[PDB]
Amino acid sequence: NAYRQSQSRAARLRLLVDTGQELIQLPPEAMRKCVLQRACAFVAMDHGLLLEWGANGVQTTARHGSKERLSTLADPLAIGPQWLERPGTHLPCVLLLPLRGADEGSFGTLVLANSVAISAPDGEDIESLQLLATLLAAHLENNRLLEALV
Amino acid sequence: NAYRQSQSRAARLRLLVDTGQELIQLPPEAMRKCVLQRACAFVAMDHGLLLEWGNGVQTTARHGSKERLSTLETTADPLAIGPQWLERPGTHLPCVLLLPLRGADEGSFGTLVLANSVAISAPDGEDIESLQLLATLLAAHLENNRLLEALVARD
Amino acid sequence: NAYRQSQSRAARLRLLVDTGQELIQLPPEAMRKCVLQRACAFVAMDHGLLLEWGANGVQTTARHGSKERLSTLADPLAIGPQWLERPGTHLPCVLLLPLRGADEGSFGTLVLANSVAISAPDGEDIESLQLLATLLAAHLENNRLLEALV
Amino acid sequence: NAYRQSQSRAARLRLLVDTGQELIQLPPEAMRKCVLQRACAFVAMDHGLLLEWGNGVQTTARHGSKERLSTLETTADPLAIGPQWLERPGTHLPCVLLLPLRGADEGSFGTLVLANSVAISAPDGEDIESLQLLATLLAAHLENNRLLEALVARD
């Protein structure tokens, strides 16, 4: 269907351009919250987390949606996206997007989660979210390097 | 197509110059309705509202059925820079465009919210950019009014 | 000529959208400098000033190009644009764009000036610059009201 | 036209996803040439350069005749937010598009400068927005490299 493809392509492009222009203007805490919110909204998922480690110990640096439900839910060796179905739980569907930096594996992960079972985002939507995750990862790392130099 | 793009660009300029000129002339309630109505028409989106916050979020203008408009979340979004296109499949308003209002003061103090009853592709980027500027023009004028009112309240 | 019109319309639209999105993100001093620079570049004029008064006495709050040449050059009752030819001078052509606020007349003016005689910008270019001047004027006034409330 | 806009949007996405993927793989000099070449091709602009500053402004990549490129001003523009389209009638490069580079650090530290030897209309807004994001992707990666180099220099 060309209309659904048409819609698909536009939504992806707007996500990238809109999130990118905002991300580079915001201070670190706001940035992480806002990228997470925009990522979640793109796939219509009602919860999310940004997790970061190795600054080993996992820290939640942004959250979207119920903290109780999100507590009901970190692989530093992961590099690829993963869609998890979790039948009969409070967050039945979860998308994991590893944040990759200077070392092997990942130093964090974007976690997008939904309170209702839903379809996995399609391959092309994941590819766009991965591009965005690369930009976020670079800014997370750069902010850490900036602080190390200070 | 060169001709079509030139003609679309003329339409964007008319929207901006004509509405920007008129905002100067109008009282705040009239400004809000004018911008919302014109913005909705410009991109053929059949619903819209304007949200403003400082108590809490207030809906200051509406276009289209109040019933469907009620289904939209109305959260303050002071951090927002630039637009957001949202797909909300299966809902009463499956497509939504957010255009923040930001003046001279720190933070966005409102959002122009356009919405459509059926799934459509996001409007052309330069339509979106024009609507974002129209929101910015509205914001400057609404903020001016607020600030002058606040200053007269101060005595 | 449809191509020159095509070019004309695009340049005007980009000016408005680009200047507007930047203006609302910048602190007051930067804002005034950047709107002036963008205005000047739009009409390919190599000098400019932003003048403000009534905070009566005229203050230069942004400048573009040679301060010496600009010294070689304020009506608070003016409201319309004006193109001045000044034959045999250091700045042979000048565009004045009054900044209108809460009172009759203007509280400032954008001055765009060129070191070489050139054609006046066309009516449509002036109309776009006037729209931009209205946005700038509102922000100048709002910044003053903000300070008055503080 | 719906079909044409969908196809243009596919081309913008390819540019972004494909180039963004490749930036990860490449050394800094290669990153700069790749983005400049692809950006110029994408909007059919026959010249370009990349400017970066911290001594002073340095031209770090070029595309097209160095002779015509020399005619462009090379001033640091740390305050710039978003693009700028310039008409420079009668010059060697009568049309110029500026796309700032901004990372995590305060201020823009460079500009992608695209330019054309003949007057053309500004590219479509969503082409411009895509090129601006490509500059942003480049910036993040160039800044990362700079910062890691600065940190190894620190011992």
Cα dihedral sign, B67-B94-A42-A84: positive
* The one-letter amino acid at C54: G
What is the distance, to the nearest Å, from the Cα of residue C26 to the centroid of all Cα atoms in its chain? 17
Distance from CA of D10 to the nearest CA of A (A): 6
Q: How was this model experimentally determined?
A: X-ray
For residue B45, give the 3-state DSSP assignment.
coil
Contact list in D for residue B7 (CB cut-off 8 A) is none
Burial category of C133 from C-beta neighbours within 10 Å (exposed 0-12, middle 13-18, buried 19 and up): buried
Find all residues with CB under 8 Å of A142, minimum gap 6, and list them.
D103, D104, D105, D140, D143, D144, D147
DSSP state of C37: H
Measured CA to CA, the distance from residue A64 to residue A62 in angstroms comes to 7
Measured CA to CA, the distance from residue A115 to residue A70 in angstroms comes to 10
Structure tokens at C21: 């999105």
Cα dihedral sign, D76-D81-D83-D89: negative
Helical (H) or strand (E) element with D62 = strand D58-63
- Name all chains with 3 or more CB-CB pairs below 8 Å to chain B: A, C, D
Q: Where are the alpha helices (DSSP H) in B77-124?
A: none
Contact between B114 and B134 under an 8 Å Cβ cutoff? The reply is no
Measured CA to CA, the distance from residue D131 to residue C127 in angstroms comes to 29
Structure tokens at B130: 């024009």
Distance from CA of D10 to the nearest CA of C (A): 23
Q: Do D125 and B121 touch (CB under 8 A)?
A: no
Name residue A64's beta-bridge partners: A48
Contact between C87 and C118 under an 8 Å Cβ cutoff? The reply is no
Measured CA to CA, the distance from residue C109 to residue C53 in angstroms comes to 9
Measured CA to CA, the distance from residue C47 to residue C118 in angstroms comes to 13
- CATH architecture under which domain A1-150 falls: 2-Layer Sandwich (3.30)
Contact between A18 and B93 under an 8 Å Cβ cutoff? The reply is no
- Angle B47-B50-B51 (CA atoms, 0-180°, nearest 5)? 130
Q: Walk across the sheet containing D47-52 and list its strands.
A: D58-63, D47-52, D110-116, D95-101, D84-87
Distance from CA of B35 to the nearest CA of A (A): 22
Residue with tokens 């408005």: C16
Q: How many residues does chain C have?
A: 150
Q: Which of A14, A25, A44 sits opposite B89 (nearest CB)?
A: A44
Contact list in D for residue C9 (CB cut-off 8 A) is 121
Return the number of other C-beta atoms located less than 10 Å from residue D1's C-beta: 9
- D51 HSE (CA, 13 A, CB side): 23
- The DSSP code sequence of D74-107 is ----TT--S-EEEE-TTSSS-EEEEEEE--SSSS
Contact between C48 and C113 under an 8 Å Cβ cutoff? The reply is yes
End-to-end, the C-alpha distance of chain C in Å comes to 53
**Between chain B and chain C, how many beta carbons pairs sit less than 8 Å apart?**
93
Measured CA to CA, the distance from residue A93 to residue A85 in angstroms comes to 5
Find all residues with CB under 8 Å of D96, minimum gap 6, and list them.
D72, D85, D86, D88, D113, D114, D115, D116
- Angle C32-C33-C38 (CA atoms, 0-180°, nearest 5)? 100
Q: Do A131 and D104 touch (CB under 8 A)?
A: no
Radius of gyration of chain A (CA): 15
Q: How do the domains of chain D map onto residue ranges?
A: 1-155
Q: Do D82 and C22 touch (CB under 8 A)?
A: yes
Q: Where are the alpha helices (DSSP H) in B48-118?
A: 66-69
- Angle A92-A95-A96 (CA atoms, 0-180°, nearest 5)? 130
Q: Do B1 and D1 touch (CB under 8 A)?
A: yes
Neighbour-count burial for C91-127, b at 16+ CB within 10 Å, e otherwise: bbbbbbbbbbbeeeebbbbbbbbbbeeeeebeeebbb
Write phi, then psi, for B60 (nearest 5 degrees).
-105, -10
Return the number of other C-beta atoms located less than 10 Å from residue B92's C-beta: 15
- The DSSP code sequence of B17-36 is HHHHHHHHHS-HHHHHHHHH
Structure tokens at C127: 């109309």
Q: Do D122 and C44 touch (CB under 8 A)?
A: no
Contact list in A for residue D137 (CB cut-off 8 A) is 20, 131, 134-135
Helical (H) or strand (E) element with D60 = strand D58-63
Helical (H) or strand (E) element with D151 = helix D125-153
Find all residues with CB under 8 Å of B136, minimum gap 6, and list them.
B101, B102, C20, C21, C24, C135
CATH classification code of D1-155: 3.30.450.40
Q: Do D81 and C17 touch (CB under 8 A)?
A: no
Burial category of B116 from C-beta neighbours within 10 Å (exposed 0-12, middle 13-18, buried 19 and up): buried
Residue with tokens 């008064």: C53
- Angle D128-C41-B6 (CA atoms, 0-180°, nearest 5)? 45
DSSP state of D133: H
Contact between B81 and A22 under an 8 Å Cβ cutoff? The reply is yes
Contact list in C for residue D121 (CB cut-off 8 A) is 3, 6-7, 9-10
For residue A95, give the 3-state DSSP assignment.
strand
Q: Do C21 and D125 touch (CB under 8 A)?
A: no
Measured CA to CA, the distance from residue C19 to residue C30 in angstroms comes to 12
Structure tokens at B61: 């203008």
Interface test with D, best of C6, C13, C14 (most D CBs within 10 A): C14
Q: Which of A14, A25, A44 sits opposite B122 (nearest CB)?
A: A14
Identify the closest residue of chain C to B147 by CA–CA distance. Answer: C145
Measured CA to CA, the distance from residue D144 to residue A141 in angstroms comes to 8
Q: Where are the alpha helices (DSSP H) in chain A?
A: 2-23, 28-42, 67-71, 123-149
Measured CA to CA, the distance from residue B2 to residue A129 in angstroms comes to 33
* The one-letter amino acid at C81: P
Structure tokens at A50: 């940004």
**B119 contact A CB<8A:** yes
Contact between A124 and A12 under an 8 Å Cβ cutoff? The reply is yes
Find all residues with CB under 8 Å of D25, minimum gap 6, and list them.
none
**B12 contact C CB<8A:** yes
Q: Do A128 and D12 touch (CB under 8 A)?
A: no
Identify the closest residue of chain B to D5 by CA–CA distance. Answer: B124
- Angle C96-C99-C104 (CA atoms, 0-180°, nearest 5)? 115
Q: Which of D81, D83, D122 sits opposite C10 (nearest CB)?
A: D122
Contact list in D for residue A28 (CB cut-off 8 A) is 104
Q: Which of B82, B119, B128 sits opposite A7 (nearest CB)?
A: B119
Measured CA to CA, the distance from residue A129 to residue D29 in angstroms comes to 27
Q: How many residues does chain A have?
A: 150
**A143 contact D CB<8A:** yes
Q: Do C11 and D125 touch (CB under 8 A)?
A: no
Helical (H) or strand (E) element with B116 = strand B110-116
Distances in Å between the alpha carbon of C73 and those of B102, C42, C45, C95, C132?
A: 35, 21, 15, 12, 23
Q: Which of B2, B6, B126 sits opposite D126 (nearest CB)?
A: B126
Q: Do B121 and D1 touch (CB under 8 A)?
A: no
Contact between A106 and A78 under an 8 Å Cβ cutoff? The reply is yes
Identify the closest residue of chain B to C31 by CA–CA distance. Answer: B104
Measured CA to CA, the distance from residue A58 to residue A43 in angstroms comes to 25
Interface test with B, best of A8, A9, A14, A124 (most B CBs within 10 A): A14
Closest-CA residue to A97 (of A149, A135, A71): A135
Indicate the resolution in Å: 1.9
